[PDB]
């Protein structure tokens, strides 16, 4: 049995359903958004939205609609998980506490039945007597509500029509009336029935059936004043009421099918409609006193590709999009000079359908940095995901040569820092913060003509300045000197570290520990350290009144960190750091009442030891490499806690989450110095400094994924990083209509250079594929190479083959024609990029589509339609076959580790194809004989082959241990709840062996890792206990939610640990933690789950 850990790094960001209504309370105006599993409630304030809750339903939320029964003060909510769990959620706020109480919950799954073609359609009676569901073809499941169902005891009402396109409840009928569009071999026919609970069977409809357009695909139940139902289609919008019939065929909507509708006015005088192309129409109903006069369709403008949109108020329409960004637009009463009444107010970042992604160590750090090809036809774009703590740069300044920053309360009365002290080579400048305006002043008492090693407020309303010549004490008023301690023999001061009441300066080998006293610097003691002092710190700790009894030092010759008790300079402890590199900045600091001595070597490596303040005994010697240049550890406070900022070429923040330090990148090119600048104009800021500029900007909270966005305006398909050329290879695929012309300026049409593939091998709207070359710094498409007419580029891999040194972009294409069903002619082009040019190095016509390709020990391993042939790169520079393999249905996915090949068949689901090099022929080591339709497949270890099928599941094939050894065993089973598009080894952080990121179609970026059996058993026990303790949103048992589910099979989850469920252990109060750990102590398990949380 294998053991694995599945955790969700990025929560899904695709909006598959969004409703509006008074859910939180009567006068509210909520905007619920049904992300795949997340249920992000909102409140529509006068500006933007005010998120109020975000509950993760244990389900794929397939239907969401708000209904208000009789007697309910505020709207309830009905949710239908795609596994067919139905729950009537109700909002209930109790002061701070917000709890989505479940009024009634139940399962409405029929044991046997064809899942309907169009998908689950769940509708509610406008007078709220029943909830009509159409899950399986032929049946129409009705849920009563007049009775108080605490289990939602639905009852099937048989339907005589087997292919129902869309069904809606009509308005203003004494009996609950459905009005659906079904397809029968004579065409499509609207029809109506009168549902009747007492009879549990339909009756004759209020107005008999009628014929509808050949592609009438939607229904809109207009409200009470008009009644009847509108029926949208490809080219017509027919309004029906039984005796009235007003049908129009506007010319604008012919261009693209309409897919989403919504009602603007409560009387339904105006309707919104959005289509696949992204347009946003506006259907207007004209009334007569009432009846309906005529229909008009107006093009409001353009938005994201609208899957589901709602009207909130004042033209604030939320265009929830599965493919693009979930926009939020304003409907101007008048034109915007472009004929568009729509102006995008806000935007919600959405990692759309992740077609494929590659992990790259961009910026040459130790940090993974995903690059996903999210989006679709018009919203295709590259998202660059990277952990970090961003900097909201408020004010940037040009000041080359900065060499130190300190804040100064130049006015003793003022609480906030009104003055910033720069320090340049061989001099010093004082900067005065008077509001956002900042002017340089002169602080009398501070010698301007010397470099400064420290200057800051100290005890007794006094400043201090420690130049390279003399420690100086300045009376804060009227800003004149009161004391100047100097080296007795007149030597330059080499180091200095001050605090509120103590100053220690290390002149060469010798120390001098001054105690600040009112208008008096009293040299308490001194000593002669053996070897030249490198760095030191006396930061106060514990609860001493600014009196630090320790003075950590680091020394030059015998590289070592020590802790000298004060004032006697007694060597409490010594610690040999080792290596040939001296310490450079050593810091003593507290982290959640856990003391540390962070000592940073001059090569970038950083150490942190657990310091015992009383006895000074360094324990838990840990090392972390944060950069290459020498580090400078400066403390700073953020939200009532003290962090540490490690200025280097890779500026890294150190903060302690749950008694475990976290080293987080800061999204900045470089930070030489820093100082917590809490000014009036910039409250709680950081004055980050670099070689050429000085910057200010508040730093963020704990880590979170930061998502750049590079729009392409054309759907990408694949991506590969070619390190040597420093560029990405992206297979865009734009749409053309007619010759042929582009419908919009796409990246492939806006490239610096382009070229059309002139190939002699082979001799509405179409897709004109390309192979973009994206610079990996500017993200500007360097070269856009267009493929042949009617050619689809399905695969792309960057590798160097054979023995030659060149690195090649290799694209496997496949000619497509409408007449055929499976492609016949393809080719494997071998591109080379050089000197801003993309040359065709080779070409190899094949006898099928090239689905997936993977470099195999320098030998290209294509996959033509149902075969996996291992090409060879000949010295003549033309691909030459080596050996084929034909025993497949269709090999779509290939992944390699060493010499083994894992082939993801279309439906046979795996084939551990192994290449025998001594013979030169493939040998099927094993197969799994389940019919698991695959989506993407990946290899973890020698005998752990992860796979993700199309029913939203995961499974782990384990090579077992006669002929039964040829059976791959499924040991892990887990209902992920997303359609996994791509796997790729890696991680986003510099306990869990292995790490496999994977995208989805909803934007989720999970992360699969292996576990030791001991932690597997421990966490499985934890998971069961948490299930017993935590109460889910819909009372959906977690074991059921993760049960490996397919239409033909259903097994409990095993060999997988729900990462999110474990991580929820962090966010449960202490008494319920004690409950969960009723039988090991709570803190130990908090530590364990923290070690798990560290991975993503």
């Amino acid at each position: 049995m294998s053991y694995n850990y599945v955790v969700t790094a990025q929560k899904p960001t695709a909006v598959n359903g969004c409703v509006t209504g008074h859910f939180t309370s009567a006068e509210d105006l909520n905007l619920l958004i049904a992300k795949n599993t997340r249920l992000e409630i909102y409140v529509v304030t006068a500006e933007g939205l005010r998120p109020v809750k975000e509950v993760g339903m244990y389900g794929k939320i397939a239907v969401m609609e708000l209904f208000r029964p009789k007697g309910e003060s505020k709207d309830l909510l009905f949710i239908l998980t795609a596994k067919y769990n139905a729950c009537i959620l109700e909002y209930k706020q109790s002061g701070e506490s917000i709890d989505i109480i479940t009024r009634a919950h139940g399962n409405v799954q029929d044991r046997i039945g064809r899942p309907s073609e169009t998908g689950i359609i769940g509708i509610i009676d406008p007078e709220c007597r029943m909830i009509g569901l159409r899950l399986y073809d032929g049946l129409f499941k009705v849920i009563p509500l007049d009775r108080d169902n605490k289990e939602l005891k639905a009852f099937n009402i048989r339907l005589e029509e087997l292919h129902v396109i869309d069904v809606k409840f009509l308005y203003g009928c004494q009996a609950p009336t459905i009005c659906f569009v079904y397809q029968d071999p004579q065409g499509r026919h609207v029809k109506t029935y009168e549902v009747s609970l007492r009879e549990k069977e339909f009756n004759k409809g209020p107005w008999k059936q009628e014929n509808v357009e050949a592609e009438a695909s939607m229904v809109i139940a207009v409200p009470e004043p008009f009644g009847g139902a509108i029926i949208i289609g490809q080219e017509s919008i027919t309004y029906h009421n039984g005796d009235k019939y007003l049908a129009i065929a506007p010319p604008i909507i012919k261009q693209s099918t309409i897919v989403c509708h919504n009602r603007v006015d409560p009387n339904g005088s105006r309707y919104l409609l959005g289509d696949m192309e992204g347009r946003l129409f506006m259907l207007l109903l004209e009334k007569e006193e009432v009846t309906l006069k005529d229909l008009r369709v107006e093009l409001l403008g353009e938005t994201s590709i609208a899957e589901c949109l709602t009207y909130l108020d004042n033209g604030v329409v939320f265009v929830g999009s599965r493919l693009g960004d979930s926009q939020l637009v304003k409907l101007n009463v008048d034109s915007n000079e472009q004929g568009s009444y729509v102006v995008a107010m806000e935007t919600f970042t959405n990692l759309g359908p992740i077609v494929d992604m590659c992990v790259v160590d961009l910026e040459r750090q130790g940090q993974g940095q995903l690059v996903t090809c999210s989006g679709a036809f018009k919203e295709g774009s590259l998202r660059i995901i990277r952990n970090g703590i961003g900097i909201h740069e408020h004010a940037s300044i040009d000041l080359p040569g900065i060499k130190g920053l300190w804040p100064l309360r130049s006015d003793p009365n003022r609480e906030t820092d009104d003055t910033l002290v720069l320090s340049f080579v061989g001099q010093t400048r004082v900067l005065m913060l008077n509001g956002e305006e900042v002017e340089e002043t002169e602080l009398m008492g501070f010698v301007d003509d010397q470099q400064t090693f420290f200057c800051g407020n100290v005890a007794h309303q006094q400043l201090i300045q420690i130049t390279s010549a003399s420690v100086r004490l300045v009376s804060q008023e009227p800003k004149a000197l009161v004391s100047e301690w100097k080296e007795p023999q007149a030597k330059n001061i080499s180091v200095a570290s001050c605090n509120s009441s103590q100053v220690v300066v290390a002149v060469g080998r010798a120390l001098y520990y001054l105690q600040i006293h009112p208008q008096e610097l009293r040299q308490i003691s001194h000593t002669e350290m053996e070897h030249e002092v490198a760095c030191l710190d006396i930061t106060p700790l514990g609860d001493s009144n600014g009196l630090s009894p320790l003075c950590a030092i680091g020394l030059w010759t015998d590289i070592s960190a020590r802790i000298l008790k004060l004032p006697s300079f007694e060597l409490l402890h010594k610690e040999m750091l080792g290596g040939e590199i001296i310490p450079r900045s050593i810091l003593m600091t507290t982290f959640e009442s856990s003391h540390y001595l962070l000592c940073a070597l001059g090569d970038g490596a950083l150490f942190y030891f657990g310091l015992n303040i009383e006895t000074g005994l360094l324990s838990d010697r840990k090392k972390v490499t944060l950069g290459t240049q020498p580090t400078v550890l400066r403390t700073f406070r953020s939200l009532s806690t003290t962090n540490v900022f490690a200025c280097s070429d890779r500026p890294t923040v150190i903060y302690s989450s749950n008694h475990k330090l976290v080293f987080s990148n800061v999204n900045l090119k470089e930070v030489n110095y820093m100082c917590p600048l809490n000014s009036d104009g910039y409250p709680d800021s950081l004055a980050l400094a670099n070689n050429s500029t000085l910057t200010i900007g508040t730093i963020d909270e704990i880590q979170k994924l930061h998502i750049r966005t590079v729009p392409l305006y054309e759907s990408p398909r694949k991506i590969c990083y070619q390190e040597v050329s420093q560029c990405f290879g992206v297979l865009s695929s734009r749409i053309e209509v007619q010759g042929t012309t582009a419908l919009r300026p796409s990246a492939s049409t806006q490239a610096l250079s382009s070229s059309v593939s002139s190939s002699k091998l082979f001799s509405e709207e179409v897709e004109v594929h390309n192979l973009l070359i994206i610079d990996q710094h500017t993200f500007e498409v360097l070269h856009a190479h267009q493929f042949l007419q009617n050619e689809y580029a399905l695969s792309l891999v960057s590798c160097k083959l054979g023995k030659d040194p060149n690195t090649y972009f290799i694209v496997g294409t496949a000619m497509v024609y409408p007449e055929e069903a499976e492609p016949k002619q393809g080719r494997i082009v071998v591109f080379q990029y050089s000197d801003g040019k993309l040359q065709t190095v080779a070409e190899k016509e094949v006898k099928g589509a090239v689905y997936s390709m993977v470099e195999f020990n320098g030998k290209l391993l294509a996959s033509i339609n149902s075969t996996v042939r291992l090409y060879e790169w000949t010295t003549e520079k033309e691909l030459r076959t080596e050996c084929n393999h034909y025993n497949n249905i269709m090999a779509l996915y290939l992944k390699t580790k060493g010499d083994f090949i894992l082939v993801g068949d279309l439906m046979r689901s795996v084939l551990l194809l192994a290449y025998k090099p001594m013979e030169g022929n493939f040998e099927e080591i094993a197969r799994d004989f389940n019919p698991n339709w695959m989506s993407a497949v990946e290899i973890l270890d020698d005998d752990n082959f992860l796979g993700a099928e199309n029913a939203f599941n995961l499974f782990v094939c384990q090579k077992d241990s006669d002929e039964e050894r040829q059976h791959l065993q499924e040991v892990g089973l887990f209902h992920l709840g997303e359609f996994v598009n791509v796997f790729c080894h890696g991680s986003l952080v510099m306990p869990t062996q292995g790490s496999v990121l994977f995208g989805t179609v909803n934007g989720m970026i999970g992360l699969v890792t292996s576990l030791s059996e001991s932690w597997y058993n421990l966490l499985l026990d934890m998971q069961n206990r948490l299930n017993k303790v935590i109460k889910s949103v819909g009372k959906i048992e977690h074991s059921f939610w993760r049960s490996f589910h397919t239409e033909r099979k259903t097994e409990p989850a095993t060999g997988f640990i729900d990462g999110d469920l474990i991580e929820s252990f962090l966010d449960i109060s202490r008494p319920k933690m004690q409950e969960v750990v009723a039988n090991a102590t709570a803190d130990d398990l908090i530590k364990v789950v923290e070690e798990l949380t560290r991975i993503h």
Partner: protein, 365 residues
């Protein structure tokens, strides 16, 4: 088909769309395979086949000579071409072998460990898949054309057994009691079938051209008595409501359980509604059959449009259930076909004939 792959990739179409469209494409391209074989072990014809419900791996077959082979359809070899080797077999040397033709072999539902069979020796034996020993045997007073177990019932384990007497027998594989009988038919009962949807709805076809659905919980006759003309030629039920003009010798509920396909010796199929017994007037053209016992046929699962595979003389006919069109006519046999069974997992069809062969049809490309 790359269009479907891209549509699934970008989340446009549900994965269900590609799954069902590809299954329909594969079934439309169905053809005999010389890249696969099933070992010849039956002396006489093959009367029945039943792929196991769960995992679709093993496969029984009731030879007309009383031998119950138990194949294994998984390509355990390494070559593209292979033959489905027969794992076990209830040979004539077996002490408890069936003395005459085995005409129904069915796996015990929800439990592959056991399977059942019945033969003209007036016996129904409950076989243990592992040790191949009769767990229970029920001896009837007359032959047994066909029997069927509920593929949905987790509550009961009754077994409708259509003997050549006029009375349907219900045998209980739990504590033995074949006492429960369903009276109301007039002649032999050539084909019975439980409802895949409802636990207790049993549809029994007879040789007097009547198809009746029985609520076996009810002990006062049948719910429905199917009638060709939907009551147009209304006549009290003493010599009326005949679902065919000759013997009706085959039943197969559609996969959803909403419709009861019937085929009879008058050379017609009829897609009857399963809730009120109203013929839905699907034409199906003229289907040829002349068998004088249970004609087996099955209906596809997991495809866009449900197909039905009916033995048609010496050929398998592929009709579309809800439109009646004739998709094609699989043509590879040398005698009349007695039973075809659909392998839902991979859209493969195994069709035992009277010429001792079991031809495995598979899709092309």
């Amino acid at each position: 088909m790359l269009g479907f792959l891209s549509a699934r990739q970008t989340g446009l179409e549900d994965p269900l769309r590609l799954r069902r469209a590809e299954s329909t494409r594969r079934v439309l391209g169905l053809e005999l395979n010389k890249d696969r074989d099933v070992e010849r072990i039956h002396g006489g014809g093959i009367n029945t086949l039943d792929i196991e419900p769960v995992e679709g791996r093993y496969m029984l077959s009731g030879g007309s000579d009383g031998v119950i082979v138990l194949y294994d359809l998984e390509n355990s070899s390494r070559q593209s071409y292979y033959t489905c080797k027969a794992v076990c077999s209830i040979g004539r040397d077996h002490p408890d072998v069936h003395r005459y033709s085995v005409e129904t072999v069915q796996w015990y539902p929800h439990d592959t460990g056991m399977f059942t069979s019945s033969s003209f020796d007036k016996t129904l034996k409950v076989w243990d898949t592992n040790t191949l020993q009769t767990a229970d045997v029920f001896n009837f007073e007359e032959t047994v054309y066909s029997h069927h177990m509920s593929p949905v019932s987790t509550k009961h384990c009754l077994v409708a057994v259509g003997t050549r007497g006029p009375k349907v027998q219900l045998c209980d594989l739990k504590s033995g009691s074949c006492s429960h009988i369903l009276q109301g038919h007039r002649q032999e009962i050539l084909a019975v079938s439980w409802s895949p949807r409802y636990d207790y709805i049993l549809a029994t076809a007879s040789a007097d051209s009547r198809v009746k659905l029985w609520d076996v919980r009810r002990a006062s006759g049948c719910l429905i008595t199917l009638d060709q003309h939907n009551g147009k030629k209304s006549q009290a039920v003493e010599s009326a409501n005949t679902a065919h003009n000759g013997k009706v010798n085959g039943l197969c509920f559609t996969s959803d359980g909403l419709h009861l396909l019937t085929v009879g010796t008058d050379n017609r199929m009829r897609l009857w509604n399963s809730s009120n017994g109203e013929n839905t007037l699907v034409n199906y053209g003229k289907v040829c059959n002349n068998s004088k016992k249970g004609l087996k046929f099955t209906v596809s699962c997991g495809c866009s449009s449900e197909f039905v595979f009916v033995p048609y003389g010496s050929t398998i006919a592929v009709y579309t259930v809800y439109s009646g069109e004739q998709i094609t006519m699989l043509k590879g046999h040398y005698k009349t076909v007695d039973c075809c069974v659909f392998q839902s997992n991979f859209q493969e069809l195994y069709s035992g004939s009277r010429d001792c062969n079991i031809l495995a049809w598979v899709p092309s490309l």
